[PDB]
């Protein structure tokens, strides 16, 4: 899962992304473990 | 404004350990990831380690992992690297970041860093420097302007830290950087000042060694015979 | 993992001018980052995510790339712009940075204003015997500087050190030792600095003799 609403569910290995506008957070990671 | 303020770096021999901590302010600490990267004495830059947030899940660099271990203590806002096992090659320039302001973020970018704490992994003996003063032989008078130095010279480990009137001189001032003799260091330092501020101003070059505690101040006084 | 190569090692530049440094990938990346740095002091951020300018970042710069290839480019150099310039992607862990494009700006030659000094009472005093000359604010960077005892007789025993390419003038400047013995620098009597710069077509040469003031 490459993105979420609790950032830490998301175990990213550099810092998710936030993708708040005006109501609406979601975070998202840019960093791929292959 | 963001701050990372690092410190504990300085000498060790081989095999021994160091534990760097890293003091955060000016932001939520724990609302970021943390890292270490750190620069080999070859300009080489190596991201060393990464400890997450909330709930704290470690990463680390393949050449370093169970020697170094990574932590924060965030009612503190504080960040270590515990180093255990040192080898020469993690001889460098260990720096703590974080990632960037908001809309310039999230993407695997080190937006803000420390100020560098530096590593050394080595035998030989930590010696404090000599300072000298250099001031003119003969003429070499009024070009309108002159020029003195310190010679800072002896020395191991580094970093050091010359300065002239304590900062109130920065203009015109060159300072060459250290160059390692037989596990020894020296390094130079000249200012250029218009012939009316001298003698009859006064000159004085404020070196310090920290890793001896030296501080020590030279008064370039002209030449007796 | 994704090592980066980044070209070409040193590039040099007039102030005016249009420059482009590259960074290449051993695999797909979607993202690249670059920092600025200078003596001193630690990596700034420089453009964020491929092609955005970290606050505080002149427009002249620029950023783009996609899949194996990356960039920045300077619209038209300055001079304080000399530097060392770092790729640095995190699109596949681990991370990594290129090993960095330096840099180096352009000007006119300009030459040495050299100075001399003996070593000093106090280290005299102590049995270390040490001289130097400095060199200062030329261009370009290719001195070179002999010493001679004497009768200029050459000698080794001499250590050298160099600045950066001053971010004002766009100079260099460098510092010159020589260390021996305090007996043998009491027995014998001149000294004297050769530094051979474009500038003037036969040595640069400040010098001084042992009993003096």
């Given at each position: 899962?490459?993105?979420?609403?609790?950032?830490?569910?998301?175990?990213?290995?550099?810092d998710?992304?936030?993708?708040?506008?005006s109501?609406?957070?979601?975070?998202?990671?840019?960093?791929?473990?292959? | 404004?963001?701050?990372?303020?690092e410190?504990?770096?300085?000498?060790?021999?081989?095999?021994?350990?160091?534990?760097?901590?890293c003091?955060?302010?000016?932001?939520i600490?724990?609302?970021?990831?943390?890292?270490?990267?750190?620069?080999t004495?070859?300009?080489?830059?190596?991201?060393?380690?990464?400890?997450?947030?909330?709930?704290?899940?470690?990463?680390?660099?393949?050449?370093?992992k169970?020697?170094?271990?990574?932590?924060?203590?965030?009612?503190?806002n504080?960040?270590?690297?515990?180093?255990?096992?040192?080898?020469?090659?993690?001889?460098?320039?260990?720096?703590?970041?974080?990632?960037?302001?908001?809309?310039?973020?999230?993407?695997?970018?080190?937006?803000?860093?420390?100020?560098?704490?530096?590593?050394?992994?080595?035998?030989?003996?930590?010696?404090?420097?000599?300072?000298?003063?250099?001031?003119?032989?003969?003429?070499?008078?009024?070009?309108?302007?002159?020029?003195?130095?310190?010679?800072?010279?002896?020395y191991?480990?580094?970093?050091?830290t010359?300065?002239?009137?304590?900062?109130?001189?920065?203009?015109?001032?060159?300072?060459?950087?250290?160059?390692?003799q037989?596990?020894?260091?020296?390094?130079?330092?000249?200012?250029?000042?218009?012939?009316?501020?001298?003698?009859?101003?006064?000159?004085?070059?404020?070196?310090?060694?920290?890793?001896?505690?030296?501080?020590?101040?030279?008064?370039?006084?002209?030449?007796?015979? | 993992?994704?090592?980066?190569?980044?070209?070409?090692?040193?590039?040099?530049?007039?102030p005016?001018?249009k420059?482009?440094?590259?960074?290449?990938?051993?695999s797909?990346?979607?993202?690249m980052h670059?920092?600025?740095q200078?003596?001193?002091?630690?990596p700034?951020?420089?453009?964020?995510?491929?092609?955005?300018?970290?606050?505080?970042?002149?427009?002249?710069?620029?950023?783009?790339?996609?899949?194996?290839?990356?960039?920045?480019?300077?619209?038209?150099?300055?001079?304080?712009?000399?530097?060392?310039?770092?790729?640095?992607?995190?699109?596949?862990?681990?991370?990594?940075?290129?090993?960095?494009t330096?840099?180096?700006?352009?000007?006119?030659?300009?030459?040495?204003?050299?100075?001399?000094?003996?070593?000093?009472?106090?280290?005299?005093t102590?049995?270390?015997?040490?001289?130097?000359?400095?060199?200062?604010?030329?261009?370009?960077?290719?001195?070179?500087?002999?010493?001679?005892?004497?009768?200029?007789?050459?000698?080794?025993?001499?250590?050298?050190?160099w600045?950066?390419?001053?971010?004002?003038?766009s100079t260099?400047?460098?510092?010159?030792?020589?260390?021996?013995?305090?007996?043998?620098?009491?027995?014998?009597?001149?000294?004297?600095?050769?530094?051979?710069?474009?500038?003037?077509?036969?040595?640069?040469?400040?010098?001084?003799?042992?009993?003096?003031?």
């Amino acid at each position: 899962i490459f993105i979420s609403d609790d950032k830490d569910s998301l175990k990213c290995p550099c810092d998710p992304e936030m993708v708040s506008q005006s109501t609406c957070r979601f975070f998202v990671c840019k960093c791929v473990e292959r | 404004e963001v701050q990372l303020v690092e410190s504990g770096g300085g000498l060790v021999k081989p095999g021994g350990s160091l534990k760097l901590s890293c003091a955060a302010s000016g932001f939520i600490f724990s609302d970021y990831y943390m890292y270490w990267v750190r620069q080999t004495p070859e300009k080489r830059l190596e991201w060393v380690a990464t400890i997450s947030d909330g709930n704290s899940y470690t990463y680390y660099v393949d050449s370093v992992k169970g020697r170094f271990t990574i932590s924060r203590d965030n009612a503190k806002n504080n960040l270590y690297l515990q180093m255990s096992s040192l080898k020469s090659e993690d001889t460098a320039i260990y720096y703590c970041a974080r990632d960037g302001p908001t809309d310039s973020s999230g993407y695997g970018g080190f937006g803000y860093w420390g100020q560098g704490t530096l590593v050394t992994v080595s035998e030989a003996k930590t010696t404090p420097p000599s300072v000298y003063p250099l001031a003119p032989g003969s003429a070499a008078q009024t070009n309108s302007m002159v020029t003195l130095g310190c010679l800072v010279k002896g020395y191991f480990p580094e970093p050091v830290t010359v300065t002239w009137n304590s900062g109130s001189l920065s203009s015109g001032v060159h300072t060459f950087p250290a160059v390692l003799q037989s596990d020894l260091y020296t390094l130079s330092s000249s200012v250029t000042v218009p012939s009316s501020p001298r003698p009859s101003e006064t000159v004085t070059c404020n070196v310090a060694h920290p890793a001896s505690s030296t501080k020590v101040d030279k008064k370039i006084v002209p030449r007796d015979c | 993992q994704s090592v980066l190569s980044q070209s070409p090692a040193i590039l040099s530049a007039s102030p005016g001018e249009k420059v482009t440094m590259t960074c290449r990938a051993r695999s797909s990346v979607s993202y690249m980052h670059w920092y600025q740095q200078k003596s001193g002091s630690s990596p700034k951020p420089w453009i964020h995510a491929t092609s955005n300018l970290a606050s505080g970042v002149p427009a002249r710069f620029s950023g783009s790339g996609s899949g194996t290839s990356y960039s920045l480019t300077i619209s038209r150099v300055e001079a304080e712009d000399a530097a060392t310039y770092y790729c640095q992607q995190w699109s596949s862990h681990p991370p990594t940075f290129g090993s960095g494009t330096k840099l180096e700006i352009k000007r006119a030659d300009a030459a040495p204003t050299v100075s001399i000094f003996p070593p000093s009472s106090e280290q005299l005093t102590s049995g270390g015997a040490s001289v130097v000359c400095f060199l200062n604010n030329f261009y370009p960077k290719d001195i070179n500087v002999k010493w001679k005892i004497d009768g200029s007789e050459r000698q080794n025993g001499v250590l050298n050190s160099w600045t950066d390419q001053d971010s004002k003038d766009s100079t260099y400047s460098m510092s010159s030792t020589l260390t021996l013995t305090k007996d043998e620098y009491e027995r014998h009597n001149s000294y004297t600095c050769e530094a051979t710069h474009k500038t003037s077509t036969s040595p640069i040469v400040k010098s001084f003799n042992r009993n003096e003031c």
